[PDB]
Each structure stands twice: as structure tokens, then as C-alpha cells.
């Protein structure tokens with residue numbers, strides 16, 4: 001996972017993140033950029049256009065919960081597997097989400113942090129977060145491994 | 146991983162596999178179908194055409210070694226992560242093979258088995274081997290996740 | 291993107307398939323459902339029992355679409371526009387499933403055509419199915 | 432495959448990038464090399480130090496080829512034929528690396544264009560880069 005310096009830089013940065021807004025944007029972007037992911041959100045309502053997706057109340061409410069779980073992961077970087085154990089079982093056994101999709105969301109989250117933070121999201125900090133989201137995606141995919 | 150009946154069906158079929166012929170064919174087909182994988186075998190010589198790859202002596206020799214290693218995995222179906230631990234470290238730290246290629250070789254092997262055995266390689270039998278090749282692929286990827 | 295050779299190889303393979311296309315489409319589905327049970331979730335209304343007439347009738351449609359594609363290798367987007375509408379807009383099939391069906395198809399063709407399923411034909415059929423899959427998962431209308 | 436909407440989003444977004452294409456090209460490469468250090472094995476002859484003149488000169492070339500691709504959206508195989516020979520025939524680049532560079536580029540553009548990098552533009556650019564990647568990884572001669 002991460003070195004002590006990588007952990008501290010990642011933690012300090014995460015404190016600036018408006019978790020609710022970033023979650024809605026990331027989940028929204030996932031459904032727009034990778035539109036098959038919308039199938040899992042059939043019951044969320046209107047998903048016919050990019051604007052409808054981004055402004056969908058349920059997409060935004062749900063992105064919040066996603067990013068809250070990510071924030072929890074940020075407090076447990078040493079044991080992401082144990083931290084996401086319940087969510088790994090849910091997404092596999094009950095939701096049948098292909099693990100490739102976990103990597104796509106992780107990457108969309110990275111792109112969202114870049115858009116929201118501009119040059120503050122440095123190459124080094126992006127690299128640190130590439131490890132985090134790779135670690136989270138693998139923790140979620142454990143029920144396949 | 147597999148049930149008792151699955152292992153039994155899988156072990157019985159595997160005793161019929163001509164490892165030289167299937168190993169040579171599988172590696173060659175990997176290099177022909179997914180041509181970028183040739184980069185990993187640059188020293189093997191001429192890989193410019195389909196015919197050259199298949200008849201390349203080093204391709205054949207090495208293909209046989211892979212399937213010997215698969216045969217080894219076939220004897221330790223419940224401890225694949227342990228059986229492939231050294232090889233995982235080799236393919237990552239020394240060869241830098243992206244783990245998505247492990248899946249592609251797994252699938253090539255299945256297609257080769259199907260081509261070599263036809264009807265005898267039934268859907269049930271194939272399904273069981275899909276579980277096997279996914280298991281080997283995941284075992285060789287262990288250094289990542 | 292397909293070579294001239296790829297296009298020739300696909301047409302050669304499909305000539306060898308002949309009137310067994312529907313049969314191979316059915317078997318490839320069967321192998322997909324059995325090897326990859328998660329794919330069954332797209333078919334909650336199907337009889338998915340071994341040898342079901344429904345899977346057979348469906349494999350004939352899949353194979354007919356594939357022969358249409360084989361007949362239109364210069365314009366797959368134009369030929370498969372309606373199927374793209376169904377698979378991308380309507381059903382929203384995760385692209386991973388297309389790889390699973392493509393693999394299943396290759397297994398089926400390899401088992402039935404061991405002399406004609408050369409490594410070069412294998413390479414060309416893989417690319418062709420990847421291309422069909424790309425069109426079917428893309429929203430471009 | 433790209434819709435008419437996609438094509439317009441790509442041209443419009445790349446137009447916004449404009450003269451900064453070279454800089455963003457280098458920053459994308461730098462971000463890829465830093466985040467995904469195995470990509471560095473494709474460039475063992477390069478000096479990959481931060482601020483490397485080679486990396487930056489090379490980013491200008493990648494950006495220029497993207498510009499060419501943006502101007503030839505209706506025939507990417509035709510316009511990018513020489514670069515296919517290079518990446519698919521000569522270098523034999525694993526397609527995973529194209530996803531890594533594509534993502535690195537999306538990260539780069541997002542950071543520099545917070546207002547213009549809308550969800551729709553993001554989608555279109557992702558598809559465009561996937562399309563370029565497919566062409567550059569294809570042996571179609």
C-alpha cells in the first residue's frame with residue numbers, strides 16, 4: 001500500500017474534499033461516461049441524458065454514500081480488504097457488478113478530484129490516489145480472487 | 146474452489162491431454178491472436194507470421210513448460226495461490242506482464258482444448274476448466290491484489 | 291480494426307460454418323450460461339434449462355446477426371444500428387459479457403471446425419467479434 | 432464508435448486546449464510514468480527525469496498526432512496508419528498502456544479545463560481516445 005509520507009499527504013489532501021459534491025459528480029460521471037453502469041441503477045429514474053443523470057436526485061444521494069465509504073477507507077488504508085468486506089459481498093453476491101467497473105469508478109473519482117482541485121491535484125498526489133483507488137477496487141473484488 | 150465431482154471430471158479429462166501438443170499450440174496462438182504478447186518473447190526469434198510463431202522451436206519448448214506448470218496446478222486445485230507464488234513474483238517483478246494477459250492465455254488454452262477434443266470437451270467440462278483457468282490467472286496476479 | 295486478410299479470414303470461416311450457424315449460436319449461448327452464470331441475469335424470462343428450445347431459437351437470431359455482420363464488414367455501425375439500439379440504449383449490456391459470449395463462440399467454432407480453425411483464423415475471428423461487440427455496446431445514434 | 436455529438440465535443444474540447452496541446456501532452460506522459468511506472472519500460476532509451484527535455488519534446492509529438500486524429504475523425508485508420516505500424520507492428524505495445532495514457536490525459540485535461548470538461552465532453556473524449564488506442568494497437572497494414 002502506502003508509505004508514511006504518502007499516507008500523510010493523501011490524508012491532508014482528503015480534508016479539502018467536499019465529500020458529498022464529489023460523490024455525486026463521480027457517480028454521475030460513471031453513468032454518463034460508461035453508460036452500461038446505468039443498468040444497475042434502473043430504479044433511479046430518468047437517465048436518458050447527461051444532464052438528467054447528473055441532476056438525478058438518487059444518483060446524487062447515492063454518490064454521497066459511495067464517497068462516505070471511500071472516506072472510511074481513507075481512515076483504514078492499512079486494511080482496505082477488511083474495511084470493504086461487507087461491500088465486496090454486496091456488489092458480488094447480490095449485485096453481480098463486474099470488478100472492472102470498480103476500477104472505472106476509481107479512475108472517474110481521480111478525474112473528478114483533478115477537475116475540482118486543478119493543479120493542486122499534483123502528479124505525485126494523483127499517483128498516491130491511483131494506489132488508493134486500485135487498493136479499494138481490489139478490496140471490492142476480493143470475492144472473485 | 147471446485148466441488149468433488151468437478152475435480153474428478155477435471156482430473157480425468159486432463160490425463161488425456163497431450164501436453165507438448167497443447168502447450169505448443171496455446172503459447173503460439175496467444176502470440177498470434179494477441180500480437181503484443183510477442184514483445185515478451187523478443188529473444189525467441191522470428192515471430193513475423195502465423196507460420197513462424199507456431200513453428201518457432203522456443204515457442205513450442207516454452208509452451209510445453211507452461212502446461213507442465215498448469216499440470217502442476219491441476220494437482221493443487223485448493224492451493225493455487227501457494228503453487229504459483231514464485232511464478233507470480235517472476236511475471237510481475239521480472240517480466241512486468243500485465244495480469245490481464247494471464248486471463249487471455251487461460252482462454253486460449255480452453256479454445257485449444259476444444260479444438261483438440263471437440264465434442265468430448267463438453268459444456269460442463271469447459272465450464273469446470275473456466276473455473277481452473279480463472280484460478281490460475283488470479284493466483285499469478287496475487288502480487289497485485 | 292480489420293485487415294483485408296482479417297475480412298477474408300472471417301468470410302472463409304463463416305463459409306465453413308455453412309448451415310450450422312444457428313446450431314453454433316445456440317451452443318455458444320449454452321456455454322456462456324454454463325461457464326458464466328452471471329450472464330443469465332440478462333435473461334430472467336428465458337427457459338435456460340439444458341437444451342431449451344428458447345436458447346436454440348435465440349442462438350439462431352444471434353448467428354443470423356453475425357452472418358449479416360460478415361456480409362457488411364466495411365460498415366458494421368450501419369448494418370448493426372438496430373442491435374446497437376437494443377444492446378446499448380435498451381438493455382445496457384456490460385461490455386464484459388460480450389467478451390464472454392465471444393470467447394464462448396470461439397470455443398464452439400474451434401470444437402466443430404478443428405481443421406479450419408487455424409491460429410490466423412482464430413486471430414481474425416477474435417478481432418471481428420471484438421468489433422461487433424464495440425458497435426453493440428456503443429451509443430452513436 | 433463516435434456519434435455526431437461525440438465528434439463535436441472532441442473538436443470543441445481540443446480547440447479549447449489549443450496551443451497548450453504540447454504542454455498537456457508532456458504532462459500526460461509525466462503523469463503516466465509517475466502513476467504507472469511499468470509504462471517507463473517502453474522508454475528505456477529516454478531520460479525520464481522530471482522536466483526531461485525528451486519527455487516534453489515527445490509530448491509535443493503525441494499531442495500533434497492527437498490533433499491529426501481530431502481532424503480526421505471519419506478515417507482514423509487512414510490518418511494514423513504509420514503510427515499503427517509503429518505501436519502495433521514495431522513496439523508491440525500492450526493495449527493496457529493505452530488505457531493508462533488515455534486516463535492520464537483525461538486527468539490532465541480535467542485539471543486544466545474545470546469549466547469545459549463537462550460529463551458529456553468527458554464521455555466523448557474517453558470514446559475518442561479508446562478509438563485512437565484501438566487503431567494504434569491494430570495490425571491492419
Ligand code: HEM
Pocket residue numbers: 037040041065066069070087090091095097101102105106136137140
Ligand atoms: C469504488 C467502488 C465502489 C464503492 C466504494 C461503492 C460503494 C457502495 C455503497 C456504500 C453502497 C451502499 C450500500 C448500502 O447502503 O447498503 C453501494 C451500493 C450499490 N452499488 Fe456500489 N460502490 C462501488 C462501485 C460500484 C459500481 C462500479 C457499481 C455499478 C457499476 C455499483 C453498483 C451499486 C448498486 C446498484 C448499489 C445499490 C444501490 C441501491 O439501489 O441503493 N457499485 N455501493
Ligand code: HEM
Pocket residue numbers: 182183185186207210211212214215232235236240242246247248250251281282285
Ligand atoms: C497464465 C498462465 C501462465 C503460466 C502457468 C506461466 C508459467 C511460466 C513458467 C513455468 C515459466 C518458466 C519460468 C521459470 O520457472 O523459471 C514462465 C516464464 C515466462 N513467462 Fe509465463 N506463464 C503464464 C502466463 C504468461 C503470460 C500471459 C505471459 C505474457 C506474454 C508470460 C510471460 C513469460 C515470459 C516472457 C517468460 C520467460 C521466458 C524465457 O525467456 O525463458 N507468462 N512462465
Ligand code: HEM
Pocket residue numbers: 329332333351352355356373376377381383387388389391392422423426
Ligand atoms: C456477439 C454479440 C451479440 C450479438 C450478435 C447479439 C445479437 C442479438 C440478437 C440478433 C437479438 C435478437 C433481437 C431481436 O429479436 O430483434 C438479441 C437479443 C438480446 N440480447 Fe444479444 N447479441 C450479442 C451479445 C449479447 C450479450 C453478451 C448479451 C448479455 C449477456 C446480450 C443480451 C441480449 C438480450 C437480453 C436480448 C433480448 C432477448 C429477448 O428478450 O428475446 N446480447 N441479441
Ligand code: HEM
Pocket residue numbers: 470473474489492493496497514517518522524528529530532533563564567
Ligand atoms: C493516445 C495514444 C498514443 C499516441 C497518439 C501516440 C503517438 C506517438 C507518436 C506521435 C510517436 C512519435 C512518432 C515520431 O517520432 O514521429 C510515438 C512514439 C512512441 N510511442 Fe506512442 N502514442 C500513444 C500511446 C503510446 C503508449 C501507451 C505507449 C507505451 C506506454 C507508447 C510508446 C511509444 C514509444 C516507446 C515510442 C518511440 C519513442 C521514441 O523513440 O521517440 N505510445 N507515439
